[PDB]
Nucleic acid binder design. Structure first.
Ligand SMILES: [Mg+2]
Ligand SMILES: [Mg+2]
Ligand SMILES: [Mg+2]
Ligand SMILES: [Mg+2]
Ligand SMILES: [Mg+2]
Ligand SMILES: [Mg+2]
Ligand SMILES: [Mg+2]
Ligand SMILES: [Mg+2]
Ligand SMILES: [Mg+2]
Ligand SMILES: [Mg+2]
Ligand SMILES: [Mg+2]
Ligand SMILES: [Mg+2]
Ligand SMILES: [Mg+2]
Ligand SMILES: [Mg+2]
Ligand SMILES: [Mg+2]
Ligand SMILES: [Mg+2]
Ligand SMILES: [Mg+2]
Ligand SMILES: [Mg+2]
Ligand SMILES: [Mg+2]
Ligand SMILES: [Mg+2]
Ligand SMILES: [Mg+2]
Ligand SMILES: [Mg+2]
Ligand SMILES: [Mg+2]
Ligand SMILES: [Mg+2]
Ligand SMILES: [Mg+2]
Ligand SMILES: [Mg+2]
Ligand SMILES: [Mg+2]
Ligand SMILES: [Mg+2]
Ligand SMILES: [Mg+2]
Ligand SMILES: [Mg+2]
Ligand SMILES: [Mg+2]
Ligand SMILES: [Mg+2]
Ligand SMILES: [Mg+2]
Ligand SMILES: [Mg+2]
Ligand SMILES: [Mg+2]
Ligand SMILES: [Mg+2]
Ligand SMILES: [Mg+2]
Ligand SMILES: [Mg+2]
Ligand SMILES: [Zn+2]
Lengths: 104, 124, 208, 138, 83
RNA sequence: AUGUGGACCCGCCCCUUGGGGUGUGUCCAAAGGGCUUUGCCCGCUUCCGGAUGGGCCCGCGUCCCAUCAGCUAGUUGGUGGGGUAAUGGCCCACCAAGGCGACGACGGGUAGCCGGUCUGAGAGGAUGGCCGGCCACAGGGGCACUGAGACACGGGCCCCACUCCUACGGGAGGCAGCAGUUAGGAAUCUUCCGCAAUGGGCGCAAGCCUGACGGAGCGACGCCGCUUGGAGGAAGAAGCCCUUCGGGGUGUAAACUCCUGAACCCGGGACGAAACCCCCGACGAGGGGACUGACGGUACCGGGGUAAUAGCGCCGGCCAACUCCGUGCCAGCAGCCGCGGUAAUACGGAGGGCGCGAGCGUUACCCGGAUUCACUGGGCGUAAAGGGCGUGUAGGCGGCCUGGGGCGUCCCAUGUGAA
């Protein structure tokens, strides 16, 4: 079975390609509690069909590039920029964590 | 700490500091004496404790105790050391193997012979 | 023997008759009677309240010396009786009692276990027919333990199986004084051993 | 807001009995009710009942103790000696059927929730099912 | 090609072989494809040879080639007896 | 040339990533050898399948430092080429401006990974040494050729560092194969025998090659088995040791009586080996025959037969085992606590005792006791520990009732979990 993942498109910024964000719960090996944990896949979108916010199943597939080894299989739930926004703030944060601050 | 805490930060494993850098943490380094000396013990002891500064193959210059009634070590004797504090002389962390190399055995000892390094005396 | 050396001096340390030296231990000469205190200069003094460790030590010595086994040999048995299914206490005593050197002394081929050791190392003994000269050999049930064919009439095994005429053999062994055979019927029921030793303590020693 | 309502009921009970109260109101949830069902079956409570305090619905829980002892401190033996949450929010606990624990060589119970519903250990074991280990009681 | 050969398994002066399928290029004692028998050349027990002609015949059919004493043993179990 | 067939372009059908058909066109085969010579054996050619081995890709797992917080320009993606057995920025040209990171990017440190090993009640911790599997490497750095396979340890080229040759121009090397030498080091083996067995290469075969391997050798380095004797033997030698001067200890220990008989001597003497091969049958199945042993005159069997090595540590408490003398805060001991300043069971010796025993001690390292990094399994008023206070970002967590989904969770079946 080619692995199939389900995720949120969080990047349209590429030609014929979408960043897909894929979460996975699971219990922590030593301490028990259920930990969320996520990873971004680059997926092949040849119609530039799928759009920011779409929730797509992504499938294992023969390599298209470095990075691109998945193709967008189908569309689950169309539109939902909460996830995109959720993800978006997470990278907004990054700005703070450095050597200075104030209004930066 | 909360579980979420123990999931975020770890626990923290430990670290045995090696009470004897016989560098290579081998069980013995060979060394050459540079000073034979005598040292005063501390706290509630008095006597004259025999002690050599040793320059090691491990690239280390360290001070070792010279166990036994009397020794034969001079400012160029080549010696084998072996690890073992001397509770009285702070900074003396290694012993000198008596009976190996330039360090003679121990002249006429009947009891704890293996340590101190003296052969089984002859007898009918 | 394996210890090899003053025997009745252990008799006196454990404070119990041990019967290591065979038949003189039945005579009014075994030191345990009319000299029952430990060996050594201080052996007749006021003996101090012995520690918890001391007592578990001595009971082990008490057992190990009675069988004439070493210690590396002893420990290797206890541990085998640990890992073994069943009550590890009296599974130990059964193995000990399965040692050929002891089984020979049980069948009264020799007056002691030490004398029984020598008869084994010197090929005087068959098991099932072929010679076995290993005192540690494990007798299994069904096995028949003979005096060696060409030994049968040595001056010693003559006068020793002569004593065994009419004498009684443990419940778990048969014996046939005519041809000088003997059989190992079953590993001994803990009740069968009259062993002057609380083996519960011996388990407790090997667990510090 | 209670962070863990189940822990709270278990606690409300723990606290009620140590002063030997007659009964105690816990605010009511189907789940809680399903647990008291078990307590009452196994006989740690005299039983529960869906009263209705001050507008909103509770579960009056009727407690059980031993007989008066003699000596100083007559106070009876507790029936619920001990009653602890196992799984809690922010560290859930799920045994499979081969790992349902045995509480006090059976003298106690462990309530766990399964997809066949809320059950004791012996119950889950027979039914061949594990789940979220809810609590243990002995 | 894949061979049917002996793999040395006893101890010093106590040879037991496993009869094995394996690519000819393994070491003689390394990872093999399938054990299909065993051989005790000292005949220390009544049970000193054992094959499984079914599997032996399988591997032959896909062109395993047996060494000279493997085939000897295989014959001795009637791998090849066709009557 | 022959075209079973196959390869390639285009088309069509079925499939559905480059899978399987089909038509036209084009392109593509071959090698001979031996005979107990017409018809067998060994080869050669194309295609289709099997088997074995491998390439590549993906999910998930894999150490320490945040006193490393930002990183990236073939970078990230596209189109089209190149290249390959094959996917891919693998490489190239052009175009878009991406990609990555607090779920720890980038950097530094350390390390071959696993089966497993050790420890632990477990959960954990520690480790990767023998053997087995994968990877990588062959003086250091590049590279391609040949080929089914290599970017090749005993193949080729170049650069660097060493050593050697040198007629001064130029050449020759590469034990991290088996042995062996030297150096470093606390420390690590024979320049042994054999291809008899198993296995590998080539050969139709006979055979050849095989420091793979099968053995032997050295070292108590580990494990296991075994011996230095057994039975009798005094109211209890001698010496040594205490002593309240009577005695007491070593001590059935010895001497000694009898008995067995490790060493050693003599004799027989292996298993591992039945195939290849030859004959019969048919070069098949099946049967018959012959050849072959490094270990080795060893294992083992039988006959003789001698009383035949005991050491090391410890005895203040923890920790089994106490007396005398010497010594005088000295000489010394010492794991920790502590001994020794003139009556020391702690030093040194003696007698005795305890523990192990061809071994016993020491050092070093690992887990343990250590719930002393606490998931199991700990804490923070005064013992070490509440942030000086808030705000509230990420994140963590979330009241009661119904329904759907079924991610977590649970269940059955099944595959895998090599040795
Ligand atoms: Mg003082
Ligand atoms: Mg002092
Ligand atoms: Mg000492
Ligand atoms: Mg042509
Ligand atoms: Mg390394
Ligand atoms: Mg633990
Ligand atoms: Mg080198
Ligand atoms: Mg190189
Ligand atoms: Mg080739
Ligand atoms: Mg080529
Ligand atoms: Mg090569
Ligand atoms: Mg290479
Ligand atoms: Mg070479
Ligand atoms: Mg070499
Ligand atoms: Mg050197
Ligand atoms: Mg060797
Ligand atoms: Mg061969
Ligand atoms: Mg070898
Ligand atoms: Mg034969
Ligand atoms: Mg041959
Ligand atoms: Mg004591
Ligand atoms: Mg004195
Ligand atoms: Mg003393
Ligand atoms: Mg002491
Ligand atoms: Mg041994
Ligand atoms: Mg711990
Ligand atoms: Mg600590
Ligand atoms: Mg905790
Ligand atoms: Mg604490
Ligand atoms: Mg304070
Ligand atoms: Mg404080
Ligand atoms: Mg405060
Ligand atoms: Mg403060
Ligand atoms: Mg929030
Ligand atoms: Mg809720
Ligand atoms: Mg939430
Ligand atoms: Mg599910
Ligand atoms: Mg399974
Ligand atoms: Zn006695």
């Amino acid at each position: 079975p080619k692995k199939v993942l389900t995720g949120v498109v969080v990047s349209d910024k590429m030609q014929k390609t979408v960043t897909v964000l894929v979460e996975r719960q699971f219990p922590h090996p030593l301490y028990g509690k259920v930990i969320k944990r996520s990873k971004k896949y680059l997926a092949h979108d040849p119609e530039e069909k799928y759009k920011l916010g779409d929730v797509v199943e992504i499938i294992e597939s023969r390599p298209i590039s470095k990075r691109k080894r998945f193709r967008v299989l189908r569309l689950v739930e169309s539109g939902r920029m909460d996830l995109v926004e959720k993800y978006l703030i997470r990278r907004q944060n990054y700005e703070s964590l450095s050597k200075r601050g104030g209004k930066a | 700490p909360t579980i979420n805490q123990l999931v975020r930060k770890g626990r923290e494993k430990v670290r045995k500091k090696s009470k004897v850098p016989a560098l290579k943490g081998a069980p013995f380094r060979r060394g050459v004496c540079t000073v034979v000396r005598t040292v005063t013990p501390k706290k509630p002891n008095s006597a004259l404790r025999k002690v050599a500064k040793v320059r090691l193959t491990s690239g280390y210059e360290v001070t070792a105790y010279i166990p036994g009634e009397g020794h034969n070590l001079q400012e160029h004797s080549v010696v084998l050391i072996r690890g073992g504090r001397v509770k009285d002389l702070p900074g003396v962390r290694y012993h000198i193997v008596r009976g190996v190399y330039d360090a003679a055995g121990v002249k006429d000892r009947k009891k704890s012979r293996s340590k101190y390094g003296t052969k089984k005396p002859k007898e009918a | 023997g394996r210890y090899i050396g003053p025997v009745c001096r252990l008799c006196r340390r454990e404070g119990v008759k041990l019967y290591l030296k065979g038949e003189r231990c039945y005579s009014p000469k075994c030191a345990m009677e009319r000299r029952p205190y430990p060996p050594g200069q201080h052996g007749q003094k006021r003996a101090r309240r012995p520690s918890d460790y001391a007592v578990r030590l001595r009971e082990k010595q008490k057992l190990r010396r009675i069988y004439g086994i070493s210690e590396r040999q002893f420990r290797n048995l206890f541990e085998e009786a640990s890992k073994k299914k069943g009550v590890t206490g009296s599974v130990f005593l059964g193995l000990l009692e399965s040692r050929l050197d002891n089984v020979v002394y049980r069948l009264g081929f020799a007056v002691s276990r030490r004398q029984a050791r020598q008869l084994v190392r010197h090929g005087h003994i068959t098991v099932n027919g072929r010679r076995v000269d290993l005192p540690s050999y494990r007798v299994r049930p069904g096995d028949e333990i003979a005096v060696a064919e060409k030994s049968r009439n040595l001056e010693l095994i003559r006068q020793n199986l002569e004593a065994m005429k009419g004498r009684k053999v443990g419940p778990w062994l048969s014996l046939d004084v005519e041809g000088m055979k003997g059989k190992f019927l079953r590993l001994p029921d803990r009740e069968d051993l009259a062993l002057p030793v609380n083996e519960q303590l011996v388990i407790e020693f090997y667990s510090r | 807001m209670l962070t863990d309502p189940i822990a709270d009921m278990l606690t409300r009970i723990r606290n009620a009995t140590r002063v030997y109260k007659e009964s105690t109101d816990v605010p009511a949830s189907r789940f809680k009710e399903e647990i008291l069902r078990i307590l009452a079956r196994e006989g740690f409570i005299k039983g529960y009942e869906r009263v209705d305090v001050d507008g909103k619905p509770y579960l009056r829980v009727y407690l059980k103790y031993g007989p008066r002892r003699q000596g100083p401190d007559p106070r009876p033996e507790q029936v619920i000696h001990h009653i602890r949450r196992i799984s809690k929010p922010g560290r859930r606990v799920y045994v499979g059927v081969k790992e349902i624990p045995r509480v006090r060589r059976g003298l106690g119970i462990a309530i766990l929730s399964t997809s066949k519903g809320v059950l004791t250990d012996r119950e889950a074991r027979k039914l061949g099912v594990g789940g979220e280990l809810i609590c243990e009681v002995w | 090609m894949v061979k049917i050969r002996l793999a040395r398994f006893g101890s010093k002066h106590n040879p037991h072989y496993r009869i094995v399928v394996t690519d000819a290029r393994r070491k003689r004692d390394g990872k093999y494809i399938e054990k299909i028998g065993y051989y005790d050349p000292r005949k220390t027990t009544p049970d000193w040879l054992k094959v499984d002609v079914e599997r032996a015949r399988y591997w032959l059919s896909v062109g395993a080639q047996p060494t000279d004493t493997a085939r000897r043993l295989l014959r001795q179990a009637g791998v090849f007896r066709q009557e």
